[PDB]
RNA sequence: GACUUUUAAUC
RNA sequence: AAAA
RNA sequence: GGCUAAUCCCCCAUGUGGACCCGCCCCUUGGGGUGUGUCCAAAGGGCUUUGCCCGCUUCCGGAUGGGCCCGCGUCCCAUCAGCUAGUUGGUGGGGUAAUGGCCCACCAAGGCGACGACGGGUAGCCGGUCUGAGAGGAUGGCCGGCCACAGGGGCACUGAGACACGGGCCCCACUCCUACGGGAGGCAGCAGUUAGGAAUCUUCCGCAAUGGGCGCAAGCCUGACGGAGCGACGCCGCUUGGAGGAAGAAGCCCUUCGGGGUGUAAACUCCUGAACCCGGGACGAAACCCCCGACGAGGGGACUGACGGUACCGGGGUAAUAGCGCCGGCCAACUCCGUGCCAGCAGCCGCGGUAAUACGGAGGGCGCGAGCGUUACCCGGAUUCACUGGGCGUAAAGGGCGUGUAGGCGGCCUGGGGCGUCCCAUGUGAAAGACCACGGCUCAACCGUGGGGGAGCGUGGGAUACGCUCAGGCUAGACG
């Protein structure tokens, strides 16, 4: 662009677009389970991925992944969404935080416990 | 809580003799003797060429594991060095050397920096007269580091300052085994130190 | 110091008042090239003395009406519509850019 | 019509030296002449002289090159490696004496035009006056 | 009414005031008109009080009214000593 | 509750009424004078203009009018009165006006 | 269950 | 037919 | 309805002076002087009572604070292009401390816009903050300056000052009282409740210090403030030991009931002594006031701390929290067992289909450590909106071609101006912050003192090469 052109139009400042309309750009959003289906992966994977249709307090109704070995979520349990997609399931852009509200932690867990929210086991 | 755990193991991983015990790290047992290979189930196994990164990460870990400083403190002393005018490399070493714990060690009042550190936190050391219980305290030039009068009578300080008779002290320092005094003369020039560390790489570790 | 500006008269159509077009010139904050911007000021002419095309000095003054804070200091050079012209044409080009197409 | 002569001249020189011409003409102008004066003094060129062509005032610019070289491509090193217009119509570039550039840690020059006349950045700093930064040469 | 008073600049348990000329109505630590000294109640250095008698006198001459402590301190610095 | 400083309200009201009273008279006499003036009655026109003047200054004594407000008043009065007597009046008492 | 390296499909 |  | 005081209200007087009108001047917008005529003052109180204190009146000036005006700068959308009637200007009037369509009547037909008017979205602005080599980008919580608001809307009264958070009036919504006529309210003050939310504290102590209001003063008021409290929310300091010294109860240690190293690490010996106990125990506070001196300068004396019996000093004294993430590559750190495209992992590339350094466990290792990790958001890397610093034949990108308006750009020589440009001096750039030096708390964080730089803009003076402008000339561009 000639300088004159630059002086007439300038450069467009590129704006960013969120991957997590968890609204209020909060770090988390509380929600409620509407459904607790199972979903199959894409690209080159196979399994019965566990998901949840959460009714957001931010006025949204999104689906969220349920990390961990096994869960205990029913068609009415309160839950905290956290942001972070699941590469294998297009459309799933949030995870449920294990250990908060009606979502139990992950029993039998031993390592990445802070994640999965599981209290420190006693080494008596 | 500056580490607090197996130490002759760090000498091992660093593949170099680190004197993190003063005594014993001389008598056929620093472990770096007849077992100079890293610790753990794979310590002996064949080693693959490290990444320019690893080489830089170990060098820093070496230099820091010597003084006992935490990354938090280490990093900050480095940033202060960086900011100041004068070859960061050396200046950093100089600031590391000015730490009271280390100075108390250079003067022999204690045999290891760890012991040295404890001797400061327990009020057995003094500076220009008033006692200072801060390992991180920074000694300036002209400062006198004595021994807590009420502590000059401890079996630990006796042995040590006794073994000091005959021992020479670093050119930037000077001591009087008599009244158990010692004087910080100047910041040790890089040349005055014989550290098993190439601080140029340390600097690079923080460039990335 | 009361600001003093020079410009051309582009309108005597008012009573005791004239419009002075003042040219400003300067380096663009980021792109550097000297750019020329302009602005019309409604100066006070107590004796409907100044006419179109007259280059006049304008002096910062005591408010005389909403939108009118200047008085004609003096006349620099009488006559020279060439400037007034540029202005009028630029004004006429306007009837065009819209829902159709005027003149060129 | 030439849109920017100082640039045309600068370029003519850039071009002529790249093929190793010996002479090289360029329409004459007081200003163009003043710049040449500096080029000659700083020793980027073997000098220059006024001339006529088809009956018009030109400036023969005698070019200068290093010596023949070894290996393939025995072409002389260039005396004028770089030479670029800085200020241009459609973005004139001015500078304060405090804003005069140090072209290539000194191994190069910068010709600026001041109210005290045309002069290398060195000279400009001397008299302590900036102006329109004309070209750059190293 | 313009005054000469003490403004708080130290820190918790470490008070340090600035002897200052200001309008009677501004925050204690607001925008003052001029600094004319400073003071350390705990005298932690051989320089815990300093004043610009020349300036102090200026404001007093144009109507500035000092606080009680302001005066106390100004007096120490010999602002009214005519002797 | 009751912040005894309701008194300021009580006081304001009296003051209000007090101010209102003074200004009313000023206007009335002002017109008054402007009236006789717009009729040539020079003697009694100035007479009153003179009271108006007095009242105004007095009003500006306390804080009713007060200021240059008073001065505008007088000015605007000694203005019209004198200009309306530009009808052959010939300032008789020439009381206020310094012809 | 069988085939395939697993799986779909197929018997 | 899908994955490698 | 009746009585009454004053520093409450009014009248007459004196007029230093001041205000207004008209001139018998200088200045230059309404500044200053002058003269005639009008016009305008005051409050008393206390004593150590014939003096002194507090206060009153008019005027000139200082200081401080503030109103108003102007140049320049200040986000996104042109899928917003035309907008405007008090609207632009004029005369007269009103209004105000004051200029002004500020408001009004009358006349005029103007004013604004592509250099983006009008409309829509978003938003308090700044010192600064974070980031970046820089240019720049993002931001404006804490602290400091300015603005705005005080349940939503409108209005004015009183004042030097308000159109007034804890003043007034009306309308509206809501709460409360109600003998249903009618009334009381406004935490965006401190604290606290409740609701919303992923989420944000004590219905604390004190007026001792600093500051403020009133008072001659004693002193009263001060949820401003000075402190303590709760929360690893942040930053800094510190501890869980130091020096010696290589063995393994019912041990998860390759469990259809299939046993690798950790590591001087432990044990254990010797030493110091976090907690904790006893004793002492602070600066912050010397003024106001009283006495001498003249209520002055100066000197003398006394009263007074929430924090707190806290910091700090001395004495005694116990070996006494460790966790969290990661180990396929990017990226520092590897093996066994379980599982078998399942269960699960995953920042990107990808991993799991019976021998998985990638899943879950275990041993081992790496990283950091009273923290560690996750999610969100900003700058960076990203020369990936490219001014510095990018591109368009085939990668995304030349308009289907022309004509042409505005605009941008402009050959050679001389001269005037000096707008751009450059230079010198000078003013402005509050403080805090940032940088450097020194200093106070044992260090540091933190804080104190001092120092230095700075673009932009104003003023005065100067330069004239280039750009510009005016004037003249040229013929190499262009046209004939
Ligand atoms: Mg797969
Ligand atoms: Mg994992
Ligand atoms: Mg009262
Ligand atoms: Mg097959
Ligand atoms: Mg199968
Ligand atoms: Mg597959
Ligand atoms: Mg009655
Ligand atoms: Mg009287
Ligand atoms: Mg009175
Ligand atoms: Mg808003
Ligand atoms: Mg960059
Ligand atoms: Mg309101
Ligand atoms: Mg509210
Ligand atoms: Mg008042
Ligand atoms: Mg009033
Ligand atoms: Mg208001
Ligand atoms: Mg309130
Ligand atoms: Mg509250
Ligand atoms: Mg809730
Ligand atoms: Mg007080
Ligand atoms: Mg009270
Ligand atoms: Mg407070
Ligand atoms: Mg040990
Ligand atoms: Mg004291
Ligand atoms: Mg008191
Ligand atoms: Mg005294
Ligand atoms: Mg990995
Ligand atoms: Mg690796
Ligand atoms: Mg396996
Ligand atoms: Mg594994
Ligand atoms: Mg810490
Ligand atoms: Mg960029
Ligand atoms: Mg991008
Ligand atoms: Mg570019
Ligand atoms: Mg590109
Ligand atoms: Mg293409
Ligand atoms: Mg084409
Ligand atoms: Mg095309
Ligand atoms: Mg054109
Ligand atoms: Mg030209
Ligand atoms: Mg100029
Ligand atoms: Mg300056
Ligand atoms: Mg500053
Ligand atoms: Mg210090
Ligand atoms: Mg000249
Ligand atoms: Mg010509
Ligand atoms: Zn060792």
Swiss-Prot record, chain B:
<feature type="binding site">
    <location>
        <position position="30"/>
    </location>
    <ligand>
        <name>Zn(2+)</name>
    </ligand>
</feature>
<dbReference type="GO" id="GO:0042274">
    <property type="term" value="P:ribosomal small subunit biogenesis"/>
</dbReference>
<dbReference type="GO" id="GO:0015935">
    <property type="term" value="C:small ribosomal subunit"/>
</dbReference>
<keyword id="KW-0694">RNA-binding</keyword>
<dbReference type="InterPro" id="IPR002942">
    <property type="entry name" value="S4_RNA-bd"/>
</dbReference>
<dbReference type="GO" id="GO:0019843">
    <property type="term" value="F:rRNA binding"/>
</dbReference>
<comment type="function">
    <text>One of the primary rRNA binding proteins, it binds directly to 16S rRNA where it helps nucleate assembly of the body and platform of the 30S subunit. Binds mRNA in the 70S ribosome, positioning it for translation.</text>
</comment>
<feature type="domain" description="S4 RNA-binding">
    <location>
        <begin position="98"/>
        <end position="160"/>
    </location>
</feature>
<feature type="binding site">
    <location>
        <position position="8"/>
    </location>
    <ligand>
        <name>Zn(2+)</name>
    </ligand>
</feature>
<feature type="binding site">
    <location>
        <position position="25"/>
    </location>
    <ligand>
        <name>Zn(2+)</name>
    </ligand>
</feature>
<dbReference type="GO" id="GO:0006412">
    <property type="term" value="P:translation"/>
</dbReference>
<dbReference type="InterPro" id="IPR022801">
    <property type="entry name" value="Ribosomal_uS4"/>
</dbReference>
From Swiss-Prot, chain C:
<dbReference type="GO" id="GO:0003735">
    <property type="term" value="F:structural constituent of ribosome"/>
</dbReference>
<dbReference type="InterPro" id="IPR019979">
    <property type="entry name" value="Ribosomal_uS17_CS"/>
</dbReference>
<dbReference type="InterPro" id="IPR019984">
    <property type="entry name" value="Ribosomal_uS17_bact/chlr"/>
</dbReference>
<dbReference type="GO" id="GO:0022627">
    <property type="term" value="C:cytosolic small ribosomal subunit"/>
</dbReference>
<protein>
    <recommendedName>
        <fullName>Small ribosomal subunit protein uS17</fullName>
    </recommendedName>
</protein>
<dbReference type="Pfam" id="PF00366">
    <property type="entry name" value="Ribosomal_S17"/>
</dbReference>
<dbReference type="GO" id="GO:0006412">
    <property type="term" value="P:translation"/>
</dbReference>
<dbReference type="GO" id="GO:0019843">
    <property type="term" value="F:rRNA binding"/>
</dbReference>
<dbReference type="InterPro" id="IPR012340">
    <property type="entry name" value="NA-bd_OB-fold"/>
</dbReference>
<comment type="similarity">
    <text>Belongs to the universal ribosomal protein uS17 family.</text>
</comment>
<keyword id="KW-0694">RNA-binding</keyword>
<dbReference type="InterPro" id="IPR000266">
    <property type="entry name" value="Ribosomal_uS17"/>
</dbReference>
From Swiss-Prot, chain D:
<dbReference type="GO" id="GO:0003735">
    <property type="term" value="F:structural constituent of ribosome"/>
</dbReference>
<comment type="function">
    <text>One of the primary rRNA binding proteins, it binds directly to 16S rRNA central domain where it helps coordinate assembly of the platform of the 30S subunit.</text>
</comment>
<dbReference type="InterPro" id="IPR035987">
    <property type="entry name" value="Ribosomal_uS8_sf"/>
</dbReference>
<comment type="similarity">
    <text>Belongs to the universal ribosomal protein uS8 family.</text>
</comment>
<keyword id="KW-0699">rRNA-binding</keyword>
<protein>
    <recommendedName>
        <fullName>Small ribosomal subunit protein uS8</fullName>
    </recommendedName>
</protein>
<keyword id="KW-0687">Ribonucleoprotein</keyword>
<dbReference type="GO" id="GO:0005840">
    <property type="term" value="C:ribosome"/>
</dbReference>
<dbReference type="GO" id="GO:1990904">
    <property type="term" value="C:ribonucleoprotein complex"/>
</dbReference>
<dbReference type="InterPro" id="IPR000630">
    <property type="entry name" value="Ribosomal_uS8"/>
</dbReference>
<dbReference type="GO" id="GO:0006412">
    <property type="term" value="P:translation"/>
</dbReference>
<dbReference type="GO" id="GO:0019843">
    <property type="term" value="F:rRNA binding"/>
</dbReference>
Curated annotation (Swiss-Prot), chain E:
<keyword id="KW-0689">Ribosomal protein</keyword>
<protein>
    <recommendedName>
        <fullName>Small ribosomal subunit protein bS16</fullName>
    </recommendedName>
</protein>
<dbReference type="GO" id="GO:0015935">
    <property type="term" value="C:small ribosomal subunit"/>
</dbReference>
<comment type="function">
    <text>Binds to the lower part of the body of the 30S subunit, where it stabilizes two of its domains.</text>
</comment>
<dbReference type="GO" id="GO:0005737">
    <property type="term" value="C:cytoplasm"/>
</dbReference>
<dbReference type="GO" id="GO:0003735">
    <property type="term" value="F:structural constituent of ribosome"/>
</dbReference>
<keyword id="KW-0699">rRNA-binding</keyword>
<dbReference type="GO" id="GO:0019843">
    <property type="term" value="F:rRNA binding"/>
</dbReference>
<keyword id="KW-0694">RNA-binding</keyword>
<dbReference type="Pfam" id="PF00886">
    <property type="entry name" value="Ribosomal_S16"/>
</dbReference>
<comment type="subunit">
    <text>Part of the 30S ribosomal subunit.</text>
</comment>
<dbReference type="GO" id="GO:0006412">
    <property type="term" value="P:translation"/>
</dbReference>
